[PDB]
Write a structure and sequence with these properties.
Chain A: It comes from Chlamydomonas reinhardtii (Chlamydomonas smithii). Chain A: It is found in: Plastid, Chloroplast thylakoid membrane. Chain A: The light-harvesting complex (LHC) functions as a light receptor, it captures and delivers excitation energy to photosystems with which it is closely associated. Chain A: Keywords: Chlorophyll, Chloroplast, Chromophore, Magnesium, Membrane, Metal-binding, Photosynthesis, Photosystem I, Photosystem II, Plastid, Thylakoid, Transmembrane, Transmembrane helix. Chain A: Its main location: plastid. The complex is a heterotrimer of chains A (about 220), B (about 230) and C (about 220). Chain A has about 220 residues and is an all-alpha fold. Helix content of chain A is about 45%, strand content about 0%. Chain B has one domain. Chain C is mainly α. Helix content of chain C is about 45%, strand content about 0%. Chain C contains four helices and no strands. Chain C starts with about 40 loop residues before the first helix and ends in an 18-residue tail after the last helix. In chain C, about 15% of the residues are buried. The chains are: A mainly alpha (about 220), B mainly alpha (about 230), C mainly alpha (about 220). Chains in contact: A-B, A-C, B-C. At the A-C interface, loops of A face α1, α2 and α3 of C. The complex binds chlorophyll B (3 copies), chlorophyll A (CLA) (4 copies) and the ligand CC1=C[C@H](O)CC(C)(C)[C@H]1/C=C/C(C)=C/C=C/C(C)=C/C=C/C=C(C)/C=C/C=C(C)/C=C/C1=C(C)C[C@H](O)CC1(C)C (4 copies). One chlorophyll B (CHL) sits at the interface of chains C and B.
């Protein structure tokens, strides 16, 4: 009996959410569980800007979640990675052979981080400005769901499929954002990769959990 | 030499930083700015991608915060650069670098202005703090609510005794100097954020950071301190 | 003294006639006219922020009392394996676990995982009931429900209600300020609040915060 829209949509506190919802959180936008306890989206325009921020953070966090897990899964699958862990995958530029992509010394073989950053900043500024106001791939489209070249497969030509895939997108993205915050905090706390953290939690679940690192940041 | 004719014919041929045809923060990639950033206020490049100032009164309070932070940050940039700059010339400060100059009050001979014992010669920390909080509260409440140097003046650009040389009598020059102020101040705020960050990661003075950079720019950049905050 | 209306006490005292926003009517408790950042221009964001303020206030009052009590009782003579508040959580990893008042047969908690499970389940239950009601209260105020939360009945008169509201929010702002102080000066000092007061009373001009001022300098 699931809706994901309208007044009787799924909400953030489940059955205890009928008086927990602001009047402006109409069941119009994907992922609207009624979670605005802080009232930060009371203005529809601030609400629109926050929805854009949420969706872009969601997509970037999904790409980043896949990019953190994949090298470690492949390194535990056997391929050579000079530094497989994600929070030192950036320090491969300062090694002797530079940042090899999949361990092959003749795939990319990057030696200078400043030129890497220059080409990244150039390309990224170009594409983010095109994302803002359009360009070669869409002069006048939606700021969030442009389509028309970002749908080479054509999944969302029906409004109902469009809506349900919107909800799926934003929810996989909230999941990935939560998991990326976890990556950050537990890399700082543990100092090991996410896959190795799961391996250690499966080794000894009652022992090697986050509480084993609880007295780590005490001033003393 | 010719006499320049009045602005009845020329009300706004110089309004380059205001109005709808104003520079924006992404140039031609900005599209059109939000409906509330219409180009009446200085430094309006249409940057509200978070919508935090969608309400007009919150936008006013944020303009106040931004301009006061900008002035304080300009003073702070000049005050962190000047003592170190003159300490590279032979003026014997206790600690010319800014994030160590506060502890000069714990020296043997106290905090000497320009490293001169016959100058201020402060020996206590909490007399400094008490005097400072007294006078700063007085003048910040004055900035808030009138005072000896102006009562019914503007909140951000009061003038009067704060425009002694009269550089804001011309409204065109005033509208241009406001943009100059806010831009120099945003630059100084960015540069004070840089001061903080590249003091934390480096621990040297900013002018010494520049000396190190121009010693070998390909080596002495911020990526040389990228692995310092690694977990364990 | 009024605490309400246009000529209420304000946060800059005599300096405060021209700074107050037009939306900060003297209607709500603790309204000293302090919105320099304009974060509560919208009445709905203002309501959500008032709820956040009052809940943070009550939680900070309970926490202030919970950090002061065990140390007082600790020098008062009572054994406290770890009396200091910012390591009172690490008692679970001791040999005898977390014993409440030093008695081995009061609580004797050995598992932090089950403690946290307990806590999450009924904190979620209670906070959802706080949001939208439940066994104590349906349709009451989100902030001052009363009924079952006034077994003594202090606030049946509107004037007593208003003055106790102001007293509540001000003791709560005091406790929030003191809790921020607890946090920052535990990180800076590494000792308890009561021991910090003892050291400040032992030597007020030497043992103050400025003695720990050069502690966080980078020096590299
Ligand atoms: C009726 C039971 C029920 C309860 C109690 C909750 C509770 C929650 N849901 Mg919800 N849900 C419930 C039913 C349902 N939810 C959902 C669907 C969702 C979604 C999609 C989401 C939620 C989210 C949330 C959270 C929002 C509030 C928050 O941020 O916590 C704030 C309070 C805490 C985080 C306290 C944590 C407890 C713990 C004691 C903290 C530990 C303390 C540390 C040791 C201190 C830190 C130390 C420092 C110094 C380093 C909250 C945990 C959101 C979420 O995941 O946010 C996290 C969210 O995105 N729910 C559905 C499907 C329709 C439900 C159906 O019944
Ligand atoms: C009575 C003594 C009095 C003193 C010592 C100051 C001193 C100061 N005011 Mg100030 N004010 C004083 C009264 C008043 N102020 C203001 C309104 C302001 C504003 C709006 C600002 C200051 C700022 C400043 C600072 C920069 C000085 C400056 O503007 O140079 C300019 C002239 C050089 C010759 C400085 C701390 C600025 C600041 O704090 O930013 C760093 C700032 O933006 N004041 C009003 C209301 C009209 C006052 C009324 O009495
Ligand atoms: C007329 C004199 C008068 C002055 C100057 C003030 C000033 C203040 N009152 Mg107010 N009051 C005054 C009269 C009255 N007040 C009140 C009732 C209240 C209340 C209930 C409250 C205030 C608060 C405040 C503060 C709000 C502004 C702020 O947040 O500071 C911002 C500026 C600072 C904090 C500067 C601090 C100075 C110091 C130099 C900082 C040290 C620098 C560090 C070394 C740098 C840090 C290093 C880093 C890197 C770690 C401010 C200190 C609020 C408060 O307590 O907030 C804190 C508050 O809740 N007042 C009453 C009763 C009606 C008054 C009657 O006359
Ligand atoms: C769904 C995402 C997700 C997943 C699968 C994991 C999984 C894991 N985390 Mg990570 N973590 C996450 C989110 C996640 N975390 C987030 C959002 C944060 C920030 C608060 C952290 C912060 C964090 C730290 C600091 C540490 C871990 C650690 C761990 C491992 C041990 C489990 C533990 O200590 O729990 C800790 C979990 C949290 C602190 C918060 C996550 C909240 C979960 C998803 C909801 C509760 C689900 C749970 C099964 C039901 C309640 C259990 C009950 C006892 C309360 C395990 C591999 C530890 C590790 O490396 O061990 C090897 C460790 O040191 N995590
Ligand atoms: C936000 C503004 C700001 C702040 C907070 C500071 C703070 C500080 N400065 Mg800096 N400074 C600033 C702006 C600032 N400065 C700017 C804009 C300049 C350029 C003109 C300087 C130039 C400067 C020098 C050259 C020196 C300082 C010094 C100092 C320290 C002692 C302050 C003192 O003795 O004042 C009280 C003194 C006066 C108000 C004036 C002098 C008193 C005369 C002699 C008598 C007048 C009667 C202190 C850390 C001193 C220091 O220790 O350097 C590390 C020092 O020698 N400052
Ligand atoms: C306009 C302000 C300004 C200026 C002039 C400088 C200047 C400098 N900084 Mg500082 N910095 C700034 C802002 C500024 N920074 C800000 C806002 C931050 C916080 C993000 C930092 C954080 C920072 C760190 C952590 C470090 C420096 C360092 C340096 C020095 C080496 C340059 C470097 O490593 O770049 C690093 C630059 C950044 C991290 C961000 C600033 C970006 C600039 C201002 C905009 C782009 C302009 C630039 C020329 C183009 C770069 C793109 C290029 C790849 C094509 C140099 C003296 C390093 C140093 O001391 O070396 C000896 C160092 O360790 N800075
Ligand atoms: C009302 C609440 C309260 C109380 C009673 C105390 C009391 C104390 N604090 Mg704590 N503190 C507080 C709030 C409070 N603090 C807050 C809000 C912060 C965060 C900014 C701190 C941060 C802090 C640190 C980092 C340290 C202390 C320390 C201390 C002790 C020495 C005093 C000192 O160095 O002052 C420092 C006070 C502050 C930094 C801010 C508090 C602002 C007060 C309440 C307002 C000014 C009142 C004052 C009497 C009048 C002005 C004095 C004039 C010289 C300017 C003393 C037991 C030191 C300690 O442990 O010594 C044993 C220490 O290292 N405190
Ligand atoms: C809703 C609500 C409600 C109420 O009202 C209020 C409040 C509470 C406020 C709210 C909440 C909010 C929240 C919670 C938020 C969160 C966020 C996040 C987490 C994000 C992330 C986010 C995240 C993200 C982006 C991520 C990203 C990622 C990436 C890029 C990655 C990258 C990378 C990788 C691959 C790895 C390698 O080696 C390198 C690098 C380079 C590193
Ligand atoms: C626009 C926008 C838009 C969208 O919508 C959203 C967003 C993005 C959010 C936004 C952004 C924002 C930003 C970026 C901000 C920033 C800020 C800063 C940086 C500040 C600084 C700021 C800064 C500042 C004040 C500074 C100041 C300074 C000072 C006082 C100084 C002092 C001093 C000195 C002299 C030195 C000595 O020896 C000591 C001391 C004592 C230390
Ligand atoms: C009102 C009035 C009135 C009457 O009528 C007239 C008069 C008297 C004239 C007036 C007054 C005025 C004034 C006082 C002014 C001031 C200004 C300033 C201080 C600025 C700054 C300004 C400032 C600024 C821009 C700043 C900037 C900064 C920067 C770039 C930085 C860079 C850097 C860094 C980061 C670090 C590294 O490693 C190095 C370097 C490379 C060094
Ligand atoms: C008004 C205004 C105005 C303008 O406009 C803007 C601005 C400036 C933004 C604003 C301001 C604001 C502020 C200042 C805020 C603050 C806050 C706080 C401080 C909080 C605390 C807060 C605090 C709190 C909650 C606290 C809590 C506590 C607790 C739970 C406790 C717990 C505990 C204890 C018992 C101890 C043991 O061992 C353990 C534990 C577990 C640890």
């Amino acid at each position: 009996g699931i809706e994901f829209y309208g007044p009787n949509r799924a909400k953030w506190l489940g059955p205890y959410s009928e008086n927990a919802t602001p009047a402006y959180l109409t069941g119009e936008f994907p992922g609207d569980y009624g979670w605005d306890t802080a009232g930060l989206s009371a203005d529809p325009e601030t609400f629109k800007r926050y929805r854009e921020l949420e969706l872009i953070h969601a997509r970037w966090a999904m790409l980043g979640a896949l990019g953190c897990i994949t090298p470690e899964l492949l390194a535990k699958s056997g391929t050579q990675f000079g530094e497989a862990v994600w929070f030192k995958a950036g320090a491969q530029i300062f090694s002797e052979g530079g940042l090899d992509y999949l361990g092959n010394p003749s795939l990319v073989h990057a030696q200078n981080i400043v030129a890497t950053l220059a080409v990244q900043v150039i390309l990224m500024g170009l594409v983010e400005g095109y994302r803002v106001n359009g360009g070669p791939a869409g002069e006048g489209l939606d700021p969030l769901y442009p389509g028309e070249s970002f749908d080479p497969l054509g999944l969302a030509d029906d409004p109902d499929t469009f809506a349900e895939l919107k909800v799926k997108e934003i929810k996989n993205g909230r999941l990935a954002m939560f998991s990326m915050f976890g990556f950050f905090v537990q890399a700082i706390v543990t100092g090991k990769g996410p896959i190795q953290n799961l391996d250690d939690h499966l080794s000894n679940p009652t022992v090697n959990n986050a509480f084993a690192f609880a007295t780590k940041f005490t001033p003393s | 030499r010719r006499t320049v004719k009045p602005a009845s014919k020329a009300s706004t041929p110089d309004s380059f930083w205001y109005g709808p045809e104003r520079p924006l923060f992404l140039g031609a990639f900005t599209g059109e700015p939000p409906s509330y950033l219409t180009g009446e206020f200085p430094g309006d490049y249409g940057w509200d991608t978070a919508g935090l100032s969608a309400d007009p009164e919150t936008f006013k309070r944020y303009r106040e915060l931004e301009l006061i932070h900008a002035r304080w940050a300009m003073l702070g940039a000049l005050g962190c650069i000047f003592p170190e700059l003159l300490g590279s010339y032979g003026v014997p400060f206790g600690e010319a670098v800014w994030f160590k100059a506060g502890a000069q009050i714990f020296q043997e001979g106290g905090l000497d202005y320009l490293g001169n014992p016959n100058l201020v010669h402060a020996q206590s920390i909490l007399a400094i703090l008490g005097t400072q909080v007294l006078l700063m509260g007085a003048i910040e409440g004055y900035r808030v609510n009138g005072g000896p140097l102006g009562e019914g003046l503007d909140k951000l650009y009061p003038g009067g005794s704060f425009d002694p040389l009269g550089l804001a009598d011309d409204p065109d020059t005033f509208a241009e100097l406001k943009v100059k102020e806010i831009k120099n101040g945003r630059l100084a705020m960015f540069s004070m954020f840089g001061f903080f960050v590249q003091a934390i990661v480096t621990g040297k003075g900013p002018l010494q950071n520049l000396s190190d950079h121009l010693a070998n720019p390909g080596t002495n950049n911020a990526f040389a301190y990228a692995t310092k905050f690694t977990p364990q | 003294i009024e605490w309400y209306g246009p000529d209420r006490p304000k946060f800059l005292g005599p300096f405060s006639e021209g700074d107050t926003p037009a939306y900060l009517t003297g209607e709500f408790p603790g309204d000293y006219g302090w919105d320099t950042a304009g974060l509560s221009a919208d009445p709905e964001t203002f309501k959500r922020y008032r709820e956040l303020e009052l809940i943070h206030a009550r939680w900070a009052m309970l926490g202030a009392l919970g950090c002061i009590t065990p140390e007082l009782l600790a020098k008062n003579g009572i054994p406290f394996g770890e009396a200091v508040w910012f390591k009172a959580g690490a008692q679970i990893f001791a040999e005898g676990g977390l014993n409440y008042l030093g008695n081995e047969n009061l609580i004797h908690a050995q598992s932090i995982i089950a403690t946290l499970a307990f806590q999450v389940v009924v904190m979620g239950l209670a906070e959802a009931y706080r949001a939208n009601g439940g066994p104590l209260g349906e349709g009451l105020d989100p902030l001052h429900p009363g009924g079952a939360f006034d077994p003594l009945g202090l606030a049946d008169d509107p004037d007593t209600f208003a003055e106790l509201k102001v007293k509540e929010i001000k003791n709560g702002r005091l406790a929030m300020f003191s809790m921020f102080g607890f946090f920052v000066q535990a990180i800076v000092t590494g000792k308890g609040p009561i021991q910090n007061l003892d050291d400040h009373l032992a030597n007020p001009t030497a043992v103050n915060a400025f003695a720990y001022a050069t502690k966080f300098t980078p020096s590299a």
